[PDB]
Design a protein around this ligand. Sequence first.
Ligand SMILES: NC(=O)C1=CN([C@@H]2O[C@H](COP(=O)(O)OP(=O)(O)OC[C@H]3O[C@@H](n4cnc5c(N)ncnc54)[C@H](OP(=O)(O)O)[C@@H]3O)[C@@H](O)[C@H]2O)C=CC1
Ligand SMILES: NC(=O)C1=CN([C@@H]2O[C@H](COP(=O)(O)OP(=O)(O)OC[C@H]3O[C@@H](n4cnc5c(N)ncnc54)[C@H](OP(=O)(O)O)[C@@H]3O)[C@@H](O)[C@H]2O)C=CC1
Ligand SMILES: NC(=O)C1=CN([C@@H]2O[C@H](COP(=O)(O)OP(=O)(O)OC[C@H]3O[C@@H](n4cnc5c(N)ncnc54)[C@H](OP(=O)(O)O)[C@@H]3O)[C@@H](O)[C@H]2O)C=CC1
Ligand SMILES: NC(=O)C1=CN([C@@H]2O[C@H](COP(=O)(O)OP(=O)(O)OC[C@H]3O[C@@H](n4cnc5c(N)ncnc54)[C@H](OP(=O)(O)O)[C@@H]3O)[C@@H](O)[C@H]2O)C=CC1
Lengths: 287, 288, 287, 287
Amino acid sequence: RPAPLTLIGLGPMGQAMGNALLDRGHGLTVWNRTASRADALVERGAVRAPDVAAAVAANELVVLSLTDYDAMYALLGPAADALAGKVVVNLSSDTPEKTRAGARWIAEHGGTLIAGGVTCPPSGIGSPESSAFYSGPSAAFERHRETLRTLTRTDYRGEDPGLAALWYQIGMVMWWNAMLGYLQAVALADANGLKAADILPHASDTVAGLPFFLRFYADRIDTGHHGGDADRLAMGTASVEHILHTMADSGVDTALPEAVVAFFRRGEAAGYAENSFSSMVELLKKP
Amino acid sequence: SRPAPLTLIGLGPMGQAMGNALLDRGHGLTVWNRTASRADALVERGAVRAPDVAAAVAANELVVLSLTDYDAMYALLGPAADALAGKVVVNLSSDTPEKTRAGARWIAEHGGTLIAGGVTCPPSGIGSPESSAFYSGPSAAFERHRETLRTLTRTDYRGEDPGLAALWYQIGMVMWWNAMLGYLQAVALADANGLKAADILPHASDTVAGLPFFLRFYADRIDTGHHGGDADRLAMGTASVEHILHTMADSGVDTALPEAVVAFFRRGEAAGYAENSFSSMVELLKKP
Amino acid sequence: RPAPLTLIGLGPMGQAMGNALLDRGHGLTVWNRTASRADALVERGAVRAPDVAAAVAANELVVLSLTDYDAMYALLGPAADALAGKVVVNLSSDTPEKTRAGARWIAEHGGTLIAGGVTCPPSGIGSPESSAFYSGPSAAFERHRETLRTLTRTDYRGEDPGLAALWYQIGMVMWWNAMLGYLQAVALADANGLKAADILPHASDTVAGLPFFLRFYADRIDTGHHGGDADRLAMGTASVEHILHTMADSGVDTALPEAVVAFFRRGEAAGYAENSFSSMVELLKKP
Amino acid sequence: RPAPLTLIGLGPMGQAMGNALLDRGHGLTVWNRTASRADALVERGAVRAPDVAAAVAANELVVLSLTDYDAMYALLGPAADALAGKVVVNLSSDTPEKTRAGARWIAEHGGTLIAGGVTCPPSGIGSPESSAFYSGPSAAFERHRETLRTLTRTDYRGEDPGLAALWYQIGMVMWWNAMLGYLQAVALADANGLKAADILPHASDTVAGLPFFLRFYADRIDTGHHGGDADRLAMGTASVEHILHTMADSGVDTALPEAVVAFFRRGEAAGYAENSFSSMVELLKKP
Ligand SMILES: NC(=O)C1=CN([C@@H]2O[C@H](COP(=O)(O)OP(=O)(O)OC[C@H]3O[C@@H](n4cnc5c(N)ncnc54)[C@H](OP(=O)(O)O)[C@@H]3O)[C@@H](O)[C@H]2O)C=CC1
Ligand SMILES: NC(=O)C1=CN([C@@H]2O[C@H](COP(=O)(O)OP(=O)(O)OC[C@H]3O[C@@H](n4cnc5c(N)ncnc54)[C@H](OP(=O)(O)O)[C@@H]3O)[C@@H](O)[C@H]2O)C=CC1
Ligand SMILES: NC(=O)C1=CN([C@@H]2O[C@H](COP(=O)(O)OP(=O)(O)OC[C@H]3O[C@@H](n4cnc5c(N)ncnc54)[C@H](OP(=O)(O)O)[C@@H]3O)[C@@H](O)[C@H]2O)C=CC1
Ligand SMILES: NC(=O)C1=CN([C@@H]2O[C@H](COP(=O)(O)OP(=O)(O)OC[C@H]3O[C@@H](n4cnc5c(N)ncnc54)[C@H](OP(=O)(O)O)[C@@H]3O)[C@@H](O)[C@H]2O)C=CC1
């Protein structure tokens, strides 16, 4: 039987979360700084709380979908003394350190923070294939897990609130870097009469073969094997210089390929030319 | 009827795999490498060791090169460059389209024909039907040597311009290197938190497997200039990349690569794109 | 923290599965009808359970890799009452309805069935490139997902156990038809002095261009667009007659090509000659 | 540079062929039994031939895009004696033996027939990645090869005109079987509330993983290795039975899946049950 809950934060993720909760039949109380972002949900049956404090008071479960944890202090700070007995499921990105700071704040005001990292876009909220990392007090998470199953599948990573944020950041460094490479490929294509649609099949093939290299290098990096049997860093330095010069010749911004070339040059200056590019995970483990 | 003979110059990871696949099929293979040790197994398997690069070029009309760059072709084939007349040089080496076009003009000045190639597979993929390579250059020479080239990978001919195969290779490699640099950063962040690459491999594999959906979602949006903040705002993304930078700094992990990503996203915000999708950053990367 | 589990079914797929589970670090207990198939696995560190019951009792997670769901009854039947509190992940092919029956049977004995459909060959078990459809009670899937992620990536389709079987059959009808076409082309080639290796490049190109046609026809079929702008069915009827007669003139068996001609002739008999071959989806569709 | 030519047959392929030849600057003379199907190409700048006989006399090169070779005899037979010194490039599908008979017929009238098998849809005409098999006298083909390169890449397969047709059918038996498998997947999907767009990703991954299996079985079939290393026919006969029954339980036509199950039952009757499904090529091969 769908338990009622409050949702604060109605950007792309929160609007989708509200629609999924209203589809399962959860009594929903919503609040958003931009009051107009709640209009469609309230027309579908969501209750518009007149203020943030009334949203927190409406239910024990308060789900937050905000840009970061500073936004949580900005919205919940005025009525922080009424956070007693409340379970705050923060589905906002932040560092493990700031996520732990938010958990301390909520606890010092009588509440319980469960940290969440949703690994799906808005279109994936409510879909069975979607998942979210969850960390923080086990008992409070277990009590509200069934409601959270409406949004995504739940993946508990442990009692430390910082864990859900670490696992989110581990995936997002891969996602953002891959997507910035796509934006760079689309720009190179544009300068050469090619649209994103023209490069889509090749771009999709490039990313669809990446799991092979993830396993290939995982086994080796863990065993400390950085041999140049499949690849040598010097060949990669040339490849990335070719990218930089190809983009500059085509009039495309070079700031991001210049940083890549700088990284490969630091690997050669460390004596890794005949080793795999994987050898540079050692430069990364260094502050 | 029978696999054609050919010369292969360049016996590093890719060339070694190419020679093996060419012999596995039944091609008469003449080989040559600067480090002669790398031809030992291929010669044992039945290949002819050319004595001095020139002899290798003279051995066959088809000369396939697997070198680090196009400068390496000039260094090896320059001494006997006048004997390149009538020869078809398939350069499977990475380089800028402009340097690839310069290589083609040099081969042409010496009476030869250059076919440019960009192999989109690792050594383990040479010989596999799954693997492909970009090809560009004079159609007749490509069409004449295609069957032999299909032993190595599938052939994707992009046109008569030799620079086309290099452009398409660079388009895919900027994506590949950036994704794999993110993987190395994820492995380092993981190591600093007691996690091996094997512990994060499930999540890393899911993250890269969901990427084809996002390439399709943003393709039409970027092509139509639709950069609305309906699915995402650059300001949210700037916070996200800042969280990566600081999660990595708090874990003692090198921050030069995440600092470049944060600087890129903060430059978009300072140019008026904060309420737009991160896709709008292609407008700052583009030429106009 | 690699959790322990039991694997029953050590045929081509099960052997690879136990192979990957041991490589990852899982405490594996195994069992097979032909005991000799567990030899290598026990040498590598697996516990050979003396009987089926002991296999089930060793761990909560019991994974089955068998030809069908009938084999689950034959093996787990005798000690079915001890299936209480056990989660049975059945990675065995069967119909959605037979998969749904097995789930009810397991719940009658106090267990929980999670249905699975592995879309990879034995060589791909353990590879991040491989995936599997999973369907069944979400909470039991969430509890055992990390262990199932050792075999392949996990694609949860929903609570209905029949969903993982439906998604598997949707792909296998394409896979089997495509590979029966390969066997036919190899036979045609053989009858004309060409080995499979001689036609392998053209066969690979033919299958590599298929995603384009799948996308081209998807929106068309979904929207009822069966116009003959790219192709007419009468042209296709001649193409498949050309295939049948090429095979007949070369002495190749013609049962499979005659069935293809028969289907296209049914398309013509229904008034679809000037329409795209796509029109024949309406002959296959449920009324 | 762009040589003049005649195009007869303006259905989907010939319309795209004509548009590509006019785009390059080729002087084009067109003719179609349905005169109206030339209207657009004539307004684009092609000359309308009053009769097939004049179309043939207009140029040495006569390209045909017709359903089959019976259409060549019907259209060109009346003025066949005026085919002397003409190069007829027939891009029409037919059996190798009927293509060889068409070449003898053109040669009896003093012309030369070049057989063609275009391996691209109409959207691929003019694309550098598109290709066409070509067979027949090398001299005549190599005289007009550059004009044919405007349509697709030219792949010469040899002097026998039947070779282009054989290589075409080798690929088309794979293409048709894969696409009929797709139509069936789409019908099973529709019966279960799933559109083609919902199954398109899995369908695309299924057909893109096929080149691995093409290589796996190519080597094995050529050396007669048909062991159950990766698969057993009996497991496969159950898989195809699961497909047949899944489709029956969902109300989908079972004619094509029945033909597949019958073929697998012939393999089990030959004692191949414990062998690879690859063993069923011996059932198809010419005695
Ligand atoms: N978008 C995506 O695809 C995904 C994002 N995420 C994560 O989920 C979170 C939310 O995502 P998304 O919906 O895109 O987020 P946005 O950053 O676009 O906005 C989320 C909400 O935060 C509110 N907000 C931000 N700053 C403040 C502040 N100082 N005071 C008050 N309210 C504030 C916004 O209010 P207002 O409506 O007034 O602007 C909005 O409702 C992020 O942390 C993101 O990393 C998770 C996975 C996917
Ligand atoms: N490695 C990979 O996975 C892939 C790489 N590629 C591309 O293929 C090409 C080949 O790279 P790869 O096979 O990895 O190997 P390398 O680039 O490491 O070496 C290739 C060959 O070049 C030779 N060489 C380099 N510089 C010179 C020189 N100045 N004079 C003479 N010979 C020279 C080497 O000789 P020696 O043996 O004596 O060192 C070696 O045989 C590159 O352009 C690369 O971008 C394509 C796709 C995948
Ligand atoms: N093989 C493949 O490439 C793939 C197959 N699959 C699916 O996975 C499942 C297993 O595959 P695969 O390993 O090839 O299967 P097999 O049918 O070849 O063998 C699987 C196991 O089932 C056991 N078994 C079969 N029938 C019975 C029975 N009546 N009673 C008891 N045990 C029985 C066999 O025991 P014993 O050793 O004693 O014979 C064997 O260990 C199938 O459902 C298949 O559709 C999934 C994707 C790929
Ligand atoms: N369409 C495709 O995607 C591909 C098809 N092909 C092959 O190319 C050929 C052309 O196919 P497509 O372009 O689709 O067109 P069709 O096969 O549907 O028709 C082609 C032309 O043949 C003519 N024609 C057919 N029968 C006769 C006859 N008895 N007498 C006179 N003219 C006749 C038609 O004239 P009318 O206008 O009067 O009907 C039409 O212009 C086929 O052999 C096909 O296998 C190869 C590659 C891809």
